[PDB]
Design a protein around this motif. Sequence first.
Motif, short mmCIF file in Angstrom:
data_model
loop_
_atom_site.label_atom_id
_atom_site.label_comp_id
_atom_site.label_asym_id
_atom_site.label_seq_id
_atom_site.Cartn_x
_atom_site.Cartn_y
_atom_site.Cartn_z
N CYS A 186 4.38 -0.37 5.15
CA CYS A 186 3.02 -0.89 5.16
C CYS A 186 2.62 -1.18 3.73
O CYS A 186 2.84 -0.35 2.84
CB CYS A 186 2.07 0.13 5.79
N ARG A 187 2.07 -2.37 3.48
CA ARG A 187 1.69 -2.78 2.14
C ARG A 187 0.19 -3.01 2.12
O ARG A 187 -0.33 -3.85 2.87
CB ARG A 187 2.42 -4.05 1.70
N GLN A 188 -0.50 -2.26 1.27
CA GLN A 188 -1.94 -2.33 1.12
C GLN A 188 -2.30 -2.74 -0.30
O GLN A 188 -1.63 -2.35 -1.26
CB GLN A 188 -2.57 -0.98 1.43
N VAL A 189 -3.36 -3.53 -0.43
CA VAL A 189 -3.92 -3.89 -1.72
C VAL A 189 -5.39 -3.53 -1.72
O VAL A 189 -6.10 -3.78 -0.74
CB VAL A 189 -3.72 -5.39 -2.03
N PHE A 190 -5.86 -2.93 -2.82
CA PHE A 190 -7.24 -2.54 -3.01
C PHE A 190 -7.78 -3.24 -4.26
O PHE A 190 -7.03 -3.46 -5.23
CB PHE A 190 -7.39 -1.02 -3.25
N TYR A 232 -1.97 -1.35 -5.70
CA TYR A 232 -0.98 -1.63 -4.67
C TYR A 232 -0.44 -0.32 -4.12
O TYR A 232 -0.12 0.60 -4.89
CB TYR A 232 0.16 -2.49 -5.23
N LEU A 233 -0.37 -0.23 -2.80
CA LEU A 233 0.11 0.98 -2.14
C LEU A 233 1.07 0.57 -1.05
O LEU A 233 0.69 -0.19 -0.15
CB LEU A 233 -1.07 1.78 -1.57
N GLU A 234 2.30 1.06 -1.12
CA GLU A 234 3.30 0.83 -0.08
C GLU A 234 3.61 2.16 0.58
O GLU A 234 4.06 3.09 -0.09
CB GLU A 234 4.56 0.21 -0.68
N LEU A 235 3.37 2.24 1.88
CA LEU A 235 3.60 3.46 2.66
C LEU A 235 4.85 3.24 3.49
O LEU A 235 5.02 2.17 4.09
CB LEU A 235 2.42 3.72 3.61
N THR A 236 5.74 4.23 3.52
CA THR A 236 6.96 4.12 4.30
C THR A 236 7.08 5.25 5.31
O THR A 236 6.64 6.38 5.08
CB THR A 236 8.23 4.10 3.42
N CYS A 237 7.69 4.92 6.44
CA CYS A 237 8.14 5.92 7.40
C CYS A 237 9.29 5.28 8.15
O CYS A 237 9.11 4.22 8.75
CB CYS A 237 7.02 6.30 8.37
N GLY A 238 10.47 5.89 8.08
CA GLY A 238 11.62 5.29 8.75
C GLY A 238 11.92 3.94 8.15
O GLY A 238 11.96 3.77 6.92
N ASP A 239 12.13 2.94 9.00
CA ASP A 239 12.38 1.58 8.54
C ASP A 239 11.12 0.75 8.40
O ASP A 239 11.21 -0.47 8.22
CB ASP A 239 13.40 0.88 9.45
N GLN A 240 9.94 1.36 8.48
CA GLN A 240 8.68 0.64 8.46
C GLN A 240 8.03 0.76 7.09
O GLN A 240 7.98 1.86 6.50
CB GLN A 240 7.74 1.18 9.54
#
Length: 136
Positions: free
Chosen positions: A129-133, A119-127
């Motif tokens: 992104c949630r990725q699953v591999f 599981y990878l959650e990327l943040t920038c500002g109020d955004q």
Amino acid sequence: TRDQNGTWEMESNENFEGYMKALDIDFATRKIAVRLTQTKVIDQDGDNFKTKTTSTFHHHRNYDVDFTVGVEFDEYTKSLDNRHVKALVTWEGDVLVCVQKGEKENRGWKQWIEGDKLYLELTCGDQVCRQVFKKK
């Protein structure tokens, strides 16, 4: 678990568009199509990581990020928005957490393993992104 080794194939990618928008990428880069898929190879020995991830944009080279947890490092995000950040990776329990200090606020990521999935959650500002591999 803290053991993130493996070859990982992206299966889910939620709100990548909002994360990208918050990064304000210049059009010379953003005019190229984004890859719909992603492979990530993680080589980990304790707190020492070597990662290789396919590029965000077509016809670009894989992006290498190598680091030791707790040791700040310079990052030039050549495969993404082409900015310099000072990155620091730490453990929060068994979650690997990175803060990328620079122009954009709340920029970083968190990555963790459950079984055969990463599981990878990327943040920038109020955004976010949630990725699953899935492990290959």
